Amino acid sequence: GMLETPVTSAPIVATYLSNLPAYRTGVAPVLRGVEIGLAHGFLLAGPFIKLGPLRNVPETAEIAGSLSAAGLVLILALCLSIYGSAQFQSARDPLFSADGWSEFAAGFLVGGEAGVAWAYVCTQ
Amino acid sequence: AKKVKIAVDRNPVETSFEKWAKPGHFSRTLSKGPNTTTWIWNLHADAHDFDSHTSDLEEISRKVFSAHFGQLGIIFIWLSGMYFHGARFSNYEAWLSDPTHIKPSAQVVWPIVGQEILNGDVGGGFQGIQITSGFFQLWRASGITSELQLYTTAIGGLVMAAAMFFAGWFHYHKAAPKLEWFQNVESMLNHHLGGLLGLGSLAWAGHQIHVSLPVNKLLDAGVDPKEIPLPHDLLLNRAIMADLYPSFAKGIAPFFTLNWSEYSDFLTFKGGLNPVTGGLWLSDTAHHHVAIAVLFLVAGHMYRTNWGIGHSMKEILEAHRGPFTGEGHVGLYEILTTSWHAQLAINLALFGSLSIIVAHHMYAMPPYPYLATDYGTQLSLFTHHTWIGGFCIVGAGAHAAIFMVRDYDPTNNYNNLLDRVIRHRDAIISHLNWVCIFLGFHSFGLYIHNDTMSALGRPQDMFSDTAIQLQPVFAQWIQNTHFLAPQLTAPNALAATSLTWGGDLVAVGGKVAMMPISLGTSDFMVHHIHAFTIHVTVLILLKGVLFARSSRLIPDKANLGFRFPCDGPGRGGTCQVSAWDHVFLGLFWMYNSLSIVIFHFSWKMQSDVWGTVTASGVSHITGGNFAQSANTINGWLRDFLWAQSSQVIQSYGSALSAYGLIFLGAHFVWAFSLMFLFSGRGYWQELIESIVWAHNKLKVAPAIQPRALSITQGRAVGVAHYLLGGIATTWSFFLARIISVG
Amino acid sequence: GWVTFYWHWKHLTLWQGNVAQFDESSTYLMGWLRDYLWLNSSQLINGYNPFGMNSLSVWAWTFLFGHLIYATGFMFLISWRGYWQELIETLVWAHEKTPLANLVYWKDKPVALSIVQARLVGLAHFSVGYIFTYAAFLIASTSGRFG
Amino acid sequence: WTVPTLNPDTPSPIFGGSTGGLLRKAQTEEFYVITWEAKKEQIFEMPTGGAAIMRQGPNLLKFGKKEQCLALTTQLRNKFKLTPCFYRVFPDGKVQYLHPADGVYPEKVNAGRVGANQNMRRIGQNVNPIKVKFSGRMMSPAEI
Amino acid sequence: AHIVKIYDTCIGCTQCVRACPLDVLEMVPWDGCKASQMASAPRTEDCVGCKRCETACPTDFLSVRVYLGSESTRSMGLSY
Amino acid sequence: DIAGLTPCSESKAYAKLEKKELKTLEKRLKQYEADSAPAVALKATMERTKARFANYAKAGLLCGNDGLPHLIADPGLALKYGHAGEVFIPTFGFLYVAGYIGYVGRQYLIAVKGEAKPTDKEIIIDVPLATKLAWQGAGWPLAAVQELQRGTLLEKEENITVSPR
Numbered sequence A: 001g002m003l004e005t006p007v008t009s010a011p012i013v014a015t016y017l018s019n020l021p022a023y024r025t026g027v028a029p030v031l032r033g034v035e036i037g038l039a040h041g042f043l044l045a046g047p048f049i050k051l052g053p054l055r056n057v058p059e060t061a062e063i064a065g066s067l068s069a070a071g072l073v074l075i076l077a078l079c080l081s082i083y084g085s086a087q088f089q090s091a092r093d094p095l096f097s098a099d100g101w102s103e104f105a106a107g108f109l110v111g112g113e114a115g116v117a118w119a120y121v122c123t124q
Numbered sequence B: 001a002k003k004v005k006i007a008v009d010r011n012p013v014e015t016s017f018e019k020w021a022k023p024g025h026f027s028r029t030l031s032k033g034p035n036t037t038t039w040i041w042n043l044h045a046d047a048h049d050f051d052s053h054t055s056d057l058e059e060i061s062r063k064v065f066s067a068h069f070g071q072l073g074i075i076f077i078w079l080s081g082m083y084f085h086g087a088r089f090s091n092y093e094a095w096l097s098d099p100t101h102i103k104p105s106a107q108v109v110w111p112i113v114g115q116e117i118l119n120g121d122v123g124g125g126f127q128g129i130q131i132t133s134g135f136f137q138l139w140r141a142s143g144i145t146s147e148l149q150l151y152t153t154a155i156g157g158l159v160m161a162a163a164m165f166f167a168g169w170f171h172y173h174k175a176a177p178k179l180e181w182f183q184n185v186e187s188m189l190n191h192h193l194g195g196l197l198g199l200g201s202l203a204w205a206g207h208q209i210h211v212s213l214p215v216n217k218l219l220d221a222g223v224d225p226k227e228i229p230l231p232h233d234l235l236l237n238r239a240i241m242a243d244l245y246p247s248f249a250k251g252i253a254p255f256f257t258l259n260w261s262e263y264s265d266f267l268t269f270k271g272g273l274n275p276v277t278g279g280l281w282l283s284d285t286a287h288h289h290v291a292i293a294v295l296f297l298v299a300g301h302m303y304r305t306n307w308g309i310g311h312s313m314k315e316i317l318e319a320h321r322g323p324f325t326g327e328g329h330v331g332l333y334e335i336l337t338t339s340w341h342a343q344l345a346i347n348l349a350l351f352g353s354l355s356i357i358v359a360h361h362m363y364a365m366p367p368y369p370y371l372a373t374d375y376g377t378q379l380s381l382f383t384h385h386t387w388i389g390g391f392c393i394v395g396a397g398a399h400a401a402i403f404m405v406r407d408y409d410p411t412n413n414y415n416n417l418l419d420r421v422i423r424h425r426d427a428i429i430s431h432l433n434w435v436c437i438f439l440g441f442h443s444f445g446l447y448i449h450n451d452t453m454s455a456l457g458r459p460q461d462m463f464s465d466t467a468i469q470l471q472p473v474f475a476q477w478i479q480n481t482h483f484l485a486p487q488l489t490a491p492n493a494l495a496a497t498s499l500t501w502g503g504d505l506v507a508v509g510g511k512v513a514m515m516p517i518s519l520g521t522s523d524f525m526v527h528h529i530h531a532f533t534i535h536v537t538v539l540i541l542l543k544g545v546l547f548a549r550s551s552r553l554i555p556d557k558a559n560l561g562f563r564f565p566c567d568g569p570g571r572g573g574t575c576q577v578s579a580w581d582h583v584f585l586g587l588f589w590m591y592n593s594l595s596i597v598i599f600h601f602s603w604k605m606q607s608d609v610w611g612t613v614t615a616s617g618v619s620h621i622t623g624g625n626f627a628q629s630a631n632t633i634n635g636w637l638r639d640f641l642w643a644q645s646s647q648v649i650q651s652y653g654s655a656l657s658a659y660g661l662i663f664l665g666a667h668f669v670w671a672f673s674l675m676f677l678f679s680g681r682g683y684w685q686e687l688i689e690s691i692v693w694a695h696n697k698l699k700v701a702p703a704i705q706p707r708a709l710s711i712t713q714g715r716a717v718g719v720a721h722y723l724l725g726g727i728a729t730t731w732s733f734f735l736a737r738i739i740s741v742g
Numbered sequence C: 001g002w003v004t005f006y007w008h009w010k011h012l013t014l015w016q017g018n019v020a021q022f023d024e025s026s027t028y029l030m031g032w033l034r035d036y037l038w039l040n041s042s043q044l045i046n047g048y049n050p051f052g053m054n055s056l057s058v059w060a061w062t063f064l065f066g067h068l069i070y071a072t073g074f075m076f077l078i079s080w081r082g083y084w085q086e087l088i089e090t091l092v093w094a095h096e097k098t099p100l101a102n103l104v105y106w107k108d109k110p111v112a113l114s115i116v117q118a119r120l121v122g123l124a125h126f127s128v129g130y131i132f133t134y135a136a137f138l139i140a141s142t143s144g145r146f147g
Numbered sequence D: 001w002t003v004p005t006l007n008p009d010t011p012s013p014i015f016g017g018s019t020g021g022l023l024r025k026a027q028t029e030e031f032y033v034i035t036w037e038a039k040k041e042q043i044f045e046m047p048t049g050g051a052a053i054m055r056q057g058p059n060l061l062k063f064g065k066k067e068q069c070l071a072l073t074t075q076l077r078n079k080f081k082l083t084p085c086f087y088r089v090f091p092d093g094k095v096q097y098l099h100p101a102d103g104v105y106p107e108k109v110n111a112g113r114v115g116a117n118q119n120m121r122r123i124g125q126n127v128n129p130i131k132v133k134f135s136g137r138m139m140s141p142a143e144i
Numbered sequence E: 001a002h003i004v005k006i007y008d009t010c011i012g013c014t015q016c017v018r019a020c021p022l023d024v025l026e027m028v029p030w031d032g033c034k035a036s037q038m039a040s041a042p043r044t045e046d047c048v049g050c051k052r053c054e055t056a057c058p059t060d061f062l063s064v065r066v067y068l069g070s071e072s073t074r075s076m077g078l079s080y
Numbered sequence F: 001d002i003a004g005l006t007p008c009s010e011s012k013a014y015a016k017l018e019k020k021e022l023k024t025l026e027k028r029l030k031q032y033e034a035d036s037a038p039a040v041a042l043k044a045t046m047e048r049t050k051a052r053f054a055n056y057a058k059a060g061l062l063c064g065n066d067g068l069p070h071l072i073a074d075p076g077l078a079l080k081y082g083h084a085g086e087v088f089i090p091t092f093g094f095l096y097v098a099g100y101i102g103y104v105g106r107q108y109l110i111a112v113k114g115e116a117k118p119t120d121k122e123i124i125i126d127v128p129l130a131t132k133l134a135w136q137g138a139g140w141p142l143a144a145v146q147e148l149q150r151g152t153l154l155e156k157e158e159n160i161t162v163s164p165r
């Protein structure tokens, strides 16, 4: 069969993945979308603020960077939505279905924008 | 316990010109003679492919052994010519008197069709082509002071060349070693470690201690070369040597009584560069070769041959067995004693990597007198030995794939290191694939980021020392550690091994020989370009070796062979799947990667090291513009290629006008090659049909049917012309530039 | 290219009044490389430099932009399909075995470009880089000199 | 001769495994199974890369595409003089048998086979492309 | 699926059948040649278009011809 | 003169060009000795330079505003004004040699087609035959024309293979 390896087949690694929102079955797709969106949205603000074109402005740097992070989350939400449209047109987990993914994309937008807003509040 | 012994066969082959008159005799396919022009190319392509002429390993080994004598004989003719031309067509004797003002020259052209203009004014009342091979500096270091000494070496070189060709004939036609002789790897390593490298180093130490050191000590003192004692007078008269080095007054008793400190006057550990000549101390070099001689002579007593003591190489390999690697190194000993290609793959890899290491160490620690201040020699030697190393490494991939197709046998390799590597090749190539993509974005993308920010009028947004900074902190730490080594970690060394680490510059004849090299943001960016282009070359070559036998596209690629064009247009198209084609593609990337290496060296040296010393300070050739300009692609185009190519394009009408012609001619050959790379033989075979019709119409059609080159030969002809044109273009550009200003 | 180089160089010398340069330097190929391509690139490649930029920085940027598209075309013309199809097969393997990414999947099986497609794609890059490089040089050399 | 029936419980060669094996296609579209009898335990080369030991008696392997199965078949026949046969297996559980289609390898002529895609003319006697134009689809003159 | 056609110049050498790496071709009885056998292409849905059969045909011009046509998972030689 | 050109012997720019080349050589000369090897070589070059400029003027060439010789290719203009030696005469000089080489090779190729193994006579040249044909080629224009009139120069259209059409 496939080449066995500790990275591919280890107990500690398997348990960690099984607890991630993507693999945690039994949770509504919308809730998983919010949990995933919040984590990525919070991180997405970092690089824009520190290395953006308006990084050296004292107060505008925080606003401009976070506002660009919010924009990228919006674009990503569109990518999630159209992916579901193309992939699911006609199985065990509700997420991998036309109904499930549409809820998942909506949750990501709500969670992602909340994370970007929450990141801004931390700064000011 | 097969004894190690000499074993030959008497008169294996007859010496006759009969087969010289029967082209293709070596191969069954070509022995029948030509019917199409394809036969002619096949004759030269398969001439030295011994492994395919016969399936007998003994017959293959005997041809390899004698073909090596022919290579040695050719080098001696070449070496003899270099020494002879130094004696008869050079200004070496004048150069010894005024090394800092006279340009070395050892080639003279005849006065025909107006080519005598190439005999430039080089100094010493001599006209000739300036040479960048560094032979004058080598001869001075060894102690050569007259053209008679050069002449005798050339005559000795021809005698050695005759001996080498006799040996090849003798050991193929008269007394050919048997296969069991060739397979004494333990014995060969013992002799080559302690005998070739070991005694060779000791013998050269004898020359340096007795000839080079006394002669160069007086030359540096200003003594006229003609008034220096001859090397044999130094050897016969211990009184003379005692004057230069008092340690000689005690003879060899200190060596045998272990009072080795008595020889401190000529066996030194100074470090640094000789201030008078700008090269390494020869007393340091002598202690180096004496130390190296002992290390290798000890190394030559490690393997067991006939007297029990020693190691068995098979036993070492089979003992190194771990939990993560299955059987381990089992089966490698049989692979490496029955496959010439496997041996060649290893040796080319390390021999090529060694040639690249030589280039870095020789420029940073100039080992010859007046080598450093001769910028043309420094640039040429570094660039020459980088190109040699590059080609050898690509060959290592080529002959690793040949082993994989021809000499690989699954029965002998089951669950060993070799087998397990093949069983996760997708994991290796997929990861190496991602690393190359990552390195391409985060190294070349930075240049594109800088070029766009600069064009938009946003210099503060660029990656540079005056902007967002990328300091090679790790390299800078190592430079400082080596600079302070003599204080605490190498107490008995007087100076740092190189002046690149730090300290003060050494100037010879008003020119900088070596000074500290600073690493900044531009150096950070260029180095990660090197890592990118090297990693890609590994990807192409390693992919060819791992997928030589099969892939998910061609499950039976081994049966097709090592060198085939494709498996047809099916499966979407299978052009260039053979392992030979991975060498073909790997050659382009090796050329791409080494071109940046020699551009990096050329611009960094001119900008930051080379220059003229004056009262105020050091003025460099390009005035320190590397730091601010080499962070954009536009900077390289304008400041390096466009500005420095001024010398080559203005060469007409001068002694350097030859470089101008070759600069254009090289551009031509390179573009000519794209005809073979961008086309296919289907078009050309149809074109020849119409051309053949015209000859048939005139009863002048050849008997050997014209054929368009094969698919593989089109790719081989393309890459050979592409490399020759590209490399020759840089060669002309470098020499016309550095000779003109350097 | 030969036609437009000939038209451009013969007119630049006329527009500067020094027709003698073309008459003397046009009879050998070093004159073209030296006195036409190298001599007239001085202003183009200074559109932006470590000291600043001017109105020619767009043509300087487009000049290198052309060289890049041209060189990218060599990849599609020199290296052919079989190499790339086998490389893509390890990328398909890597995606399927990667956790947290094999949740996403493709609908069209990735494959290398076809034999015929890569010739067109390589020729398109070759032509575009060809055109954009000379357009930037033609306009920049002529406009900066007089305009 | 009758069509053999596949036995899913047939033992498989001694193989550690590799990364060149089946992919997600096998679980969604199809895969291929090759079976044969071995006179003695021997080492052979896997078309997916590596070496495997064939057990004495029946052996069974699974491959991702047909060409891989027929590549192993050539190796077994030419070197080991064996007589392997392989199937096409679908995810729904259906099994399709092929090679040898009728029990005799195609290289050997056998009565009962019906010629297919045979044109009783030469290549030079095909019609011109103009005469098969606007036939509803791109059609070569050889097709008609 | 590709198109594979056998023409009446076949001499029944069987080289095309041996060359084929996907068992697309086979030999059938015939009376139009000395060998009394002709090549057949009953399983063209498995053809990949390698044209190894055309490489192996001795007759001039070829007696077996492959016309690349519509692509699919099998004809594109994919294992994924 | 012709096309606005002037004889090089009467051209001011042509004369100035000679001084420039001699001046360059003289400048290098004064850094050597009177009769040293480099000095002798430079003096030899200057003699050839002076001879070259005298020969081209004596030949009656035409110089342009650049002060460099230009050649006349029209046969009518060449013979009209005595420029036949520039292009016209060398035209028939080359064709004789070019036809010589081609005719000799064609004779050899026909000669070996009658042999048992023509291919082995092409990689391994039959030197005795080649030398025989090399000397007889001096009369190729006469032999070439007679073949044309007798109709044995060209193959028949029916004996030449062609592709389907």
Ligand code: CLA
Binding pocket: B013, B014, B015, B016, B017, B019, B020, B026, B062, B063, B064, B066, B067, B069, B070, B165, B166, B167, B168, B169, B172, B173
């Ligand atoms: C005059 C002496 C002589 C004679 C008559 C023979 C005769 C024979 N030898 Mg022997 N041989 C000789 C000397 C001689 N050898 C020497 C000196 C060596 C040591 C290198 C060898 C090594 C040797 C080997 C290893 C083999 C033979 C073989 C042969 C046979 C065929 C050789 C052939 O076809 O050569 C014709 C080939 C050439 C004329 C090529 C010459 C190549 C040399 C090395 C010059 C290289 C120049 C180099 C490329 C220059 C750069 C080129 C660049 C400027 C373009 C034949 C029985 C072969 C044999 O028996 O096969 C069954 C065989 O495998 N010989």
Ligand code: CLA
Binding pocket: B064, B065, B068, B069, B072, B181, B182, B184, B185, B187, B188, B191, B192, B195, B196
């Ligand atoms: C102390 C012994 C000794 C020495 C010095 C050498 C030296 C060499 N061997 Mg090695 N070799 C040895 C023992 C030795 N070998 C033994 C015991 C075996 C059998 C197991 C081999 C088997 C072997 C093979 C199979 C090959 C070599 C080759 C080489 C050469 C590699 C290229 C090089 O560096 O050229 C450097 C060049 C020089 C130093 C100048 C020329 C050679 C000088 C004169 C040293 C001669 C050493 C010789 C063994 C002394 C006896 C010669 C004769 C009187 C019997 C090199 C000359 C390769 C080669 O190139 O062969 C031609 C090669 O193919 N050797």
Ligand code: CLA
Binding pocket: B202, B203, B205, B206, B207, B209, B210, B234, B235, B236, B237, B238, B241, B247, B248, B250, B251, B252, B255, B263, B290
């Ligand atoms: C391989 C390297 C090498 C060689 C060949 C030599 C050689 C020499 N060294 Mg040097 N030396 C070396 C390395 C070497 N050295 C190193 C590494 C060091 C640093 C430790 C030194 C340090 C050193 C010192 C400090 C001195 C020398 C000296 C000498 C000379 C005399 C040695 C002596 O007393 O020998 C004693 C005896 C022998 C070596 C045996 C000789 C055997 C002969 C050749 C046998 C001949 C037999 C034959 C059948 C007879 C001919 C018959 C025929 C005519 C018919 C001698 C020229 C001395 C000298 O004079 O310097 C100027 C000296 O003072 N060396």
Ligand code: CLA
Binding pocket: B044, B045, B046, B047, B048, B049, B050, B348, B391, B392, B393, B394, B395, B396, B398, B399, B402, B563, B580, B583, B720
């Ligand atoms: C120690 C070095 C070494 C040795 C001994 C060999 C030996 C061999 N190689 Mg390997 N190889 C090497 C280095 C080496 N290789 C390197 C560095 C590379 C990378 C470029 C390769 C790449 C390579 C490939 C890709 C192949 C081999 C093959 C072979 C085999 C047949 C070679 C042959 O017939 O050539 C005959 C020689 C020629 C046809 C002459 C080539 C002339 C070149 C192209 C000229 C280039 C320009 C010139 C140097 C300078 C200008 C010339 C001027 C006239 C304009 C043979 C076993 C072939 C094989 O089948 O192996 C099993 C094969 O396919 N090698």
Ligand code: CLA
Binding pocket: B433, B434, B436, B437, B438, B439, B440, B441, B444, B445, B448, B536, B539, B540, B585, B588, B589, C068, C071, C072, C073, C074, C075, C078, C079, C083
């Ligand atoms: C300038 C010409 C050029 C370029 C840009 C490339 C680029 C590449 N080659 Mg190719 N190649 C070339 C010439 C070129 N090649 C030639 C002439 C040959 C024939 C010898 C080959 C032969 C060849 C082989 C055989 C291989 C490559 C590989 C690669 C890749 C290296 C790794 C990587 O992904 O880097 C990162 C990508 C880049 C640096 C490209 C430029 C990226 C820009 C600057 C930034 C991105 C733009 C940004 C997103 C904005 C887009 C906006 C737009 C959408 C509107 C890469 C795609 C290797 C590969 O695939 O490795 C995985 C590989 O195996 N090449």
Ligand code: CLA
Binding pocket: F074, F075, F076, F077, F080
């Ligand atoms: C390649 C084509 C070509 C061209 C464009 C020319 C052009 C010219 N030729 Mg030349 N000529 C050519 C080939 C050519 N010639 C050839 C192959 C030959 C035979 C070897 C000649 C023989 C020749 C002679 C003998 C004369 C010219 C002359 C001329 C000039 C005016 C007449 C003329 O030919 O008009 C256009 C050309 C053609 C239509 C092609 C055929 C030209 C024939 C062969 C010559 C016509 C001469 C004409 C009747 C002279 C009348 C007197 C004149 C002063 C008006 C003109 C510069 C005349 C001259 O010197 O004028 C100053 C002149 O006397 N030519």
Ligand SMILES: CC1=C(C/C=C(\C)CCC[C@H](C)CCC[C@H](C)CCCC(C)C)C(=O)c2ccccc2C1=O
Binding pocket: B675, B676, B677, B679, B680, B681, B684, B707, B708, B709, B710, B711, B713, B714, B715
């Ligand atoms: C130009 C070209 C050709 C045509 C080139 C050919 C046929 C090679 C020509 C070699 C020489 C010039 C011909 C043989 C010369 C003889 C040895 C006789 C010469 C006699 C004297 C003049 C020396 C291909 O065959 C080809 C094949 C595959 C991909 C690309 C190409 C390709 O680009």
